[PDB]
Amino acid sequence: AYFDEKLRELTAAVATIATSYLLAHVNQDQHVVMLTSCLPGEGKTTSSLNLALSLAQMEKTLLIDCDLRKPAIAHRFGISGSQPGVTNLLNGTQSLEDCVYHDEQSGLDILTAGVYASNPLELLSSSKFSELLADLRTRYQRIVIDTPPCLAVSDSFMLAQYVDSVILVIDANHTRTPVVREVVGKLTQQGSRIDGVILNRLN
Amino acid sequence: LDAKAYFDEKLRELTAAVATIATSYLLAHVNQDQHVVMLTSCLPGEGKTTSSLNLALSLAQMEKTLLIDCDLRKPAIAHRFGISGSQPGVTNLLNGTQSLEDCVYHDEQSGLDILTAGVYASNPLELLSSSKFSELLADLRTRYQRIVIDTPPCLAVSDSFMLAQYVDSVILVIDANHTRTPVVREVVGKLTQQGSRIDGVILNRLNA
Ligand SMILES: N[C@@H](Cc1ccc(OP(=O)(O)O)cc1)C(=O)O
Ligand SMILES: N[C@@H](Cc1ccc(OP(=O)(O)O)cc1)C(=O)O
């Protein structure tokens, strides 16, 4: 049943235009961009690729899958589970060349989550992670980071230290605003600021 | 320089797709007797082919469906599924070069069956006014639950006024941003003053 997949993913794409516009033409200094939600199932992963796909039109961009717990990016580009990714780099198994997947339908570069890692937050709080991000900055104009939810784990409060912009994805049909207000509060009380929302509408 | 071209194809495709949902619903759940349905416009450039696509694709999820390209003059269907222009289709069948089996292309991403216009033919109205064209339609009726036919614009050539005799329903595709209603009212009259009746509109909105 293809036509409804076409409506869902086409809709998902337009729901990210104003966010993609702002980044491309207003805050051009925001080189590393982090997408997150308060809970699972709010459209965060498809908003991430859709954002990265459009930023790929004007800049050499990288999409990184950083939900090392339930990773989806590799799934949605039809990428191998074999394909080495982010954890592979941090663990020094493979190098960046044998890790980036190039979707040259689009020009986008994709760094998948990589093989399983039982220490996801340990890995992400690494100084091998901060070093990896610093190196990717000097190689890419834009980087888009898919993160796991803000209330499930602490990963994303950890990552936000490292990024230039946080975009908060919200299933406006179901997430309640007092929750959002609390998540915004938790970020504010450690430093990070929210630079924009994406309001998906799911059923 | 920017992503306007990328986002505008998506927005155009999304608007085009959404414009065919109510049409498809009506056919799937209200007018189930209308097995062969014809889409057309008054002029070129009104969204008619992608409306014929999405409609067929959408009917495919509930019924065994066939999309036929019958604009033998400026054909688009084959182009939009990434099918070779070589691929035999309607003209091939009418000219008896190929038979029906190694003519139909199956899009197995979607379940839809597609019959392209086929190789070029300089006798287009000649061919469609054939009897073996009607015999081809009679056979396709017994093989498909729905048949969706993309046809030429009404005011360019007369092909579609001829085709309407063979179909159970005519759907008129309209670029409501640009087509003017007295034009539409005139084309409706031309069908009204022969057999055909219009059973529904699809209102595209385009950005020339
Ligand atoms: N693609 C659909 C639904 C969707 C659901 C979940 C999803 O992934 P996650 O919840 O992990 O962000 C992505 C997309 C939409 O955005 O409308
Ligand atoms: N090519 C655009 C718009 C378009 C589509 C079909 C179309 O058909 P026609 O020119 O025959 O009316 C016209 C314009 C789209 O994919 O929606």
Author numbering:
A (entry chain B): 508 to 710
B (entry chain A): 504 to 711
From the study:
Here, we show that a tyrosine phosphoregulatory system controls the biosynthesis and abundance of Vibrio exopolysaccharide (VPS), an essential biofilm component of the pathogen Vibrio cholerae. The phosphorylation state of the tyrosine autokinase VpsO, mediated by the tyrosine phosphatase VpsU, directly modulates VPS production and also affects the kinase’s own degradation, to regulate VPS production. We found that VpsO and VpsU have respective kinase and phosphatase functions, and we have determined crystal structures of VpsU and the VpsO catalytic domain. We found that the VpsU tyrosine phosphatase controls VPS production through regulation of the VpsO phosphorylation state. Together, our data suggest that the phosphorylation state of the C-terminal tail of VpsO, modulated by autokinase and VpsU phosphatase activity, regulates the functional state of VpsO to control VPS production and biofilm formation in V. cholerae.
We found that the only version of VpsO-503 that we could crystallize was VpsO-503E519A, R522A, R525A, which contains mutations in a conserved ExxRxxR motif in the kinase domain (E519, R522, R525). We determined the structure of VpsO-503E519A, R522A, R525A from x-ray diffraction data at a resolution of 2.9 Å. Two VpsO molecules are present in the asymmetric unit; these molecules dimerize through the α1 helix, which contains the mutated ExxRxxR motif. The kinase domain adopts the expected α/β mononucleotide-binding fold with a seven-stranded β-sheet surrounded by eight α-helices. In contrast, the VpsO-503E519A, R522A, R525A protein used for crystallization lacks the N-terminal extension found in other BY-kinases, and alternatively, its α1 helix is longer at its N-terminus. This helix likely contacts the adenine base of ATP, and it contains two glutamates (E512 and E516) that could coordinate the ribose. Refinement of the VpsO structure revealed unmodeled electron density in the ATP binding site that is consistent with the presence of a phosphorylated tyrosine residue. The phosphate is located in a position similar to that of the β-phosphate of ADP in the Wzc structure. It is coordinated through hydrogen bonding to backbone amides (residues 548–550) in the P-loop and through T552, which are all part of the canonical Walker A motif. In addition, R583 stacks against the tyrosine aromatic ring. The position of the phosphotyrosine suggests that it should inhibit nucleotide binding, and we do not observe ADP in the active site despite its presence at 1 mM in the crystallization buffer.
